A paper describes a structure:
Using this expression approach we expressed and purified six Esx complexes and determined the crystal structures of M. abscessus EsxEF (EsxEFma), encoded by the MAB_3112 and MAB_3113 genes, [name] [name] (EsxGHms), encoded by the [name] and [name] genes, and M. tuberculosis EsxOP (EsxOPmt), encoded by the Rv2346c and Rv2347c genes, at resolutions of 1.96 Å, 2.70 Å, and 2.55 Å, respectively. The structures of these complexes were determined by single wavelength anomalous diffraction (EsxEFma and EsxGHms) and multiple wavelength anomalous diffraction (EsxOPmt) at resolutions of 3.0 Å, 2.70 Å, and 2.55 Å, respectively. The α-helices of each subunit are connected by a flexible loop containing the canonical ESAT-6/CFP-10 signature motif (Trp-Xaa-Gly; WXG) although the EsxGms CFP-10 homolog contains a modified motif (His-Xaa-Gly). The WXG-containing loops are well ordered in the EsxGHms complexes and in most of the EsxEFma complexes but the majority of the connecting loops are disordered in the EsxOPmt subunit structures. The average amount of buried surface area in the subunit interfaces varies considerably [EsxEFma, ∼1605 Å2; EsxGHms, ∼1555 Å2; EsxOPmt (form I), ∼1025 Å2; and EsxOPmt (form II), ∼1175 Å2] and the percentage of the surface of each subunit buried in the complex interface is also highly variable, from 13.5–33%, and is related to the degree to which the termini of the subunits are ordered and to the conformations that they adopt. The C-termini of the CFP-10 homolog subunits of our EsxGHms and EsxOPmt (forms I and II) structures, which contain the secretion motif, are ordered and adopt helical structures; in the EsxOPmt structure the secretion motif containing helix is an extension of the C-terminal helix of the α-helical hairpin while in EsxGHms the secretion motif is primarily contained in a short, 13 amino acid, helix linked to the α-helical hairpin by a short turn.
Residue numbers in the entry:
A (entry chain D): 1 to 83
B (entry chain C): 5 to 91
C (entry chain A): 5 to 94
D (entry chain B): 7 to 86
The structure:
């Protein structure tokens, strides 16, 4: 029988849904980064953080958020195909 | 002159995006949470480890958006708007 | 527990609409500025008076959104998110 | 000319409707999130609801006053 075979359709659909969020997080992060660049001259040393420093920290943090999220996604898919 | 409304508008738009990002992280978190009709042992260990990390990085990303909102986002545009009213 | 992501989401979404109002107000202002030119004297003075009033009330509405944000909006959601992370790891 | 002016009138009327709709939407959402509200500044959610609605009426009315004055003025220009 397998319980993994029994729930396959929904586990697969759920993998599809998690991965959708990987894409949305990447995209929204890239936009935010482009728009922060477009607005550079509006940025002052308020925090003491320059706009260049923020851009870099933003991209780094986003790349890390997606990978952390994708690790979870993969952990799910491993079961779906463990079957 | 006409720069001001255009600046306010753009700072608002970035501010909306920062907020949608925040919302998306939360939603993603809920999708990940419901995938937990699944794991056990070292894959759950891998999942818990990956989750704890994802939580950790979110706090980072929210912390970074707080900074951007103050500089060029929702607070920034609010400040400019009220400042233009004062002047 | 799973109530927390829902709250964060709900508040962030409110925060977005707050920002989108500020954006709508700003786009309405641009459309207003670009349609003064046409008038003169009495019709203009009425416009300018209506404009100075609109610019004043936007300030108040922005001030009001600033309060919403801290209580149930962008800032609120951030605090819940960051507070959830500090409690989770500790 | 009459068209440029009347186009601008129609442009402004878009924003009158827009300002209202989103303000109402915000009003509704703030009510829906009443239980998450505390006196941060010190302002209650009821106080904010009332102040928000009141301030959204005067904002839209300020703006419609521009659109109307613009509209009523332009009609006088074409008849001239």
């Amino acid at each position: 029988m397998s319980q993994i075979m029994y729930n396959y359709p929904a586990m697969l659909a759920h993998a599809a849904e998690m991965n959708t969020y990987s894409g949305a997080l990447h995209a929204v992060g890239a936009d935010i980064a482009a728009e922060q660049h477009a607005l550079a001259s509006a940025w002052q040393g308020d925090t003491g953080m320059t706009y260049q420093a923020w851009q870099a920290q933003w991209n780094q943090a986003m790349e890390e958020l997606v990978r952390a999220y994708r690790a979870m996604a993969t952990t799910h898919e491993q079961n779906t195909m463990a079957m | 002159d006409a720069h001001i409304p255009q600046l306010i508008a753009s700072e608002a738009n970035f501010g909306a995006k920062a907020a949608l990002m925040r919302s998306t992280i939360a939603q993603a978190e809920q999708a990940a949470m419901s995938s937990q009709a699944f794991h056990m042992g070292e894959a759950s260990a891998a999942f818990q480890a990956a989750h704890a990390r994802f939580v950790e990085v979110s706090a980072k990303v929210n912390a970074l958006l707080d900074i951007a909102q103050l500089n060029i986002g929702d607070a920034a545009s609010s400040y400019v708007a009220q400042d233009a009213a004062a002047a």
